[PDB]
Amino acid sequence: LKTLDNLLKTLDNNQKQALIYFKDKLQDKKYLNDLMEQQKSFLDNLQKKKEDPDLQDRLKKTLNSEYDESQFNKLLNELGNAKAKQFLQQLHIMLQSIKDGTLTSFSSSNFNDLQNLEQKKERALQYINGKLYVEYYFYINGISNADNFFETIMEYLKT
């Protein structure tokens, strides 16, 4: 518990609220469909390209989608204080940019089928939430390590 408290002592209110937000999405089963689609799409690519039979055979099995506080704390410990704070801070910026309507991505062709900002905010939020969930459970399942979780989720959180 000492290392977890050593991280929480370094976090501001914005980072602490991003932590509550991320943990909350990991406990939401409505994102299970996103993980199954990601699982199928990733297995199909490996099968098509005849790559990594060991990983394909692990991907034919059911992924664990159960939340566990100790596994959550282990991810933050494996990232180290620095990466964990950079991740929570960037999660704050992404969420604030959606809330404010200032996210640059909103002007992209990727949202131009939507009539108003509220619809745009909903697409952005539902996509970020799905990515936080998918990336965490790919880690929990051993398909990716803590460093891979970090670099992959930071790509999606870029503003």
Binding site: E37, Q38, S41, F42, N45, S105, S107, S108, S109, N110, F111, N112, R123, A124, Y127, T152, E155, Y156
Partner: protein, 126 residues
């Protein structure tokens, strides 16, 4: 006399008014483009002593190719769709597919559409 004839035609565009055969000096016409085409240049043209000012252009939208995306190991960010119409001047956002990292220059994941032409980023096996 400083009178003009009919204003010039522009590909995938048209004038906002009904076409007259003769136009008075300093008279003006405005152009509009087809649904997904983007106007580039001035919207209005004026008849200046028997000659019209330079008409604008209506530039083509970019059609996001599912096959190019598959070959470059990329996908559209924010959506599950592999089909997208991008207008000239708009940015398109991509992500690497899972298991791939960016192999093209940084900032290539966000790129501008211009008259049907788009530069796609490339991702390579991690």
């Amino acid at each position: 006399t400083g009178k003009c004839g009919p204003p010039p035609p522009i590909d995938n565009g048209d004038i906002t008014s009904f076409p007259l055969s003769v136009y008075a000096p300093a008279s003006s016409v405005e152009y509009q483009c087809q649904n997904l085409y983007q106007l580039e240049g001035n919207k209005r043209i004026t008849c200046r002593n028997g000659q019209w000012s330079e008409p604008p252009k209506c530039l083509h939208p970019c059609v996001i190719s599912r096959e190019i995306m598959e070959n470059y190991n990329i996908a559209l960010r924010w959506t599950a769709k592999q089909k997208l119409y991008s207008r000239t001047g708009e940015s398109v956002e991509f992500v690497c597919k899972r298991g791939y990292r960016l192999s093209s220059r940084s900032h290539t994941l966000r790129t501008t559409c211009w008259d049907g032409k788009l530069e796609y980023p490339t991702c390579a096996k991690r």
